[PDB]
Amino acid sequence: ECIENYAKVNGIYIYYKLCKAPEEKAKLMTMHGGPGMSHDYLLSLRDMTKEGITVLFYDQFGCGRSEEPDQSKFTIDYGVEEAEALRSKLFGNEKVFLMGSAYGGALALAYAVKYQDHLKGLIVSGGLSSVPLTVKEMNRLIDELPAKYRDAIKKYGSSGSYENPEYQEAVNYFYHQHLLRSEDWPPEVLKSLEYAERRNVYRIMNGPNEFTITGTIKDWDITDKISAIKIPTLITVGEYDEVTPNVARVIHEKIAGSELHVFRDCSHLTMWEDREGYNKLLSDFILKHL
Ligand SMILES: CC(C)C[C@H](NC(=O)[C@@H](N)Cc1ccccc1)C(=O)O
Ligand SMILES: CC(C)C[C@H](NC(=O)[C@@H](N)Cc1ccccc1)C(=O)O
């Protein structure tokens, strides 16, 4: 059973779940996506504890069970400092591996750019170094959808009528094709989605949905900074990932020595679509860079 707590970090109370032992070989911090989701959908990574990998989960500022800070702090830079504060105020000076999913991936990239000296390795899953680029690729995905849904997206989407059933059915389709390719989504994934809708971070930083990123990060782009990352890096992406392998390729190019792995028959939530394979890949990576 993991150890759960609700302590104050860089000024605000953050919820975290530390799943450690047995025979710990390394520690791994995880950064969920959204922005504005919760750690819940990453729980499948908990399996790695059986491989000697302690896993740290936590809900970022304003996310899930964590308290929301002042609006002025709704930035990726703030998320990075929040993350370093948690690592230090939990593992002291220990070197740790960092894993980020989607937005969590971009956040993990920003973190590495500044604090890679506190890391043994970096893992980015369905991540991005440029929101604009990700939008470009997502737009292509929308057009590749059957006219039926594609039209509803451009129609109600351009009218801000996200409360329409046709538009809604179009979003559901896109999700079942590029977010999670499953007819029965796990409770953990559903909980994080619910959390995003309940809090404000998702609406303020991201936007109405996965492919309608009109939040405060819409222009965020640090592709020209990531080349400064020199630590072991593992980049993963799903074949049908809403954050396409083309976006992943851009990250891979800049980080020398990094690895790029495309999960066939998978989309964005690769940790659920191929749980055993996803965990094995990360476990082998971590264990080979102690
Ligand atoms: C639906 C939630 C749980 C999934 C999440 N998705 C994201 O992080 C998107 N915000 C990706 C994005 C695109 C462009 C610019 C910023 C972010 C996840 O899988 O973690
Ligand atoms: C899309 C419906 C079923 C809710 C839920 N989606 C979310 O919580 C957002 N991340 C995406 C969203 C899409 C459309 C309308 C509101 C939110 C889900 O997919 O389970």
> CATH number of the domain that 15 lies in?
3.40.50.1820
- Ligand 1 neighbour 103 (Cβ under 6 A): yes
Distance CA 113, CA 103 (A): 15
What 3 state SS string does the chain have? CCEEEEEECCCCEEEEEEECCCCCCEEEEEECCCCCCCHHHHHHHHHHHHHCEEEEEECCCCCCCCCCCCHHHCCHHHHHHHHHHHHHHHHCCCCEEEEEECHHHHHHHHHHHHHHHHEEEEEEECCCCEHHHHHHHHHHHHHCCCHHHHHHHHHHHCCCCCCCHHHHHHHHHHHHHHCCCCCCCCHHHHHHHHHHHHCCHHHHHHCCCCCCCCCCCCCCECCCCHHHCCCCEEEEEECCCCCCHHHHHHHHHHCCCCEEEEECCCCCCHHHHCHHHHHHHHHHHHHCCC
Q: Please, which residues bridge with residue 259 across strands?
A: 234
Q: Resolution of this PDB entry, in A?
A: 2.0
- Print the domain residue range for 148: 1-290
Q: Which candidate, 140, 90, 142, places its Cα nearest to that of 118?
A: 90
86 token code pair: 């948690």
C-alpha distances (whole Å) from 198 to each of 37, 99, 126, 134, 265 are: 9, 25, 24, 25, 31
Q: Which candidate, 192, 220, 218, 199, places its Cα nearest to that of 207?
A: 218
Backbone angles phi, psi at 13, to 5 degrees: -80, 120
Residue nearest (by alpha carbon) to ligand 2 atom 6: 193
Distance CA 15, CA 32 (A): 13
Positive or negative torsion for Cα 88, 91, 93, 98: negative
Rg (CA), the chain: 18
C-alpha distances (whole Å) from 43 to each of 24, 62, 92, 153, 269 are: 18, 19, 24, 31, 12
Domain count, the chain: 1
Residues 6+ apart with CB under 8 A from 237: 125, 126, 243, 244, 245, 247, 248, 260, 261, 262, 263, 270
Residues 6+ apart with CB under 8 A from 27: 20, 53, 54, 55, 56, 91, 94, 96, 97
- Ligand 1 neighbour 220 (Cβ under 6 A): no
ω into 35 cis (within 30 of 0): yes
Atom of ligand 1 nearest to the CA of 135: 14
Strands in 96-101's sheet, in edge-to-edge order, are 3-8, 13-19, 53-58, 26-31, 96-101, 119-125, 233-238, 259-263
170 token code pair: 């179009």
Name the method of structure determination.
X-ray
Only one residue has tokens 């594609």, namely 150
- CA 209–ligand 2 middle distance (angstroms): 7
Distance CA 272, CA 47 (A): 12
Atom of ligand 1 nearest to the CA of 206: 10
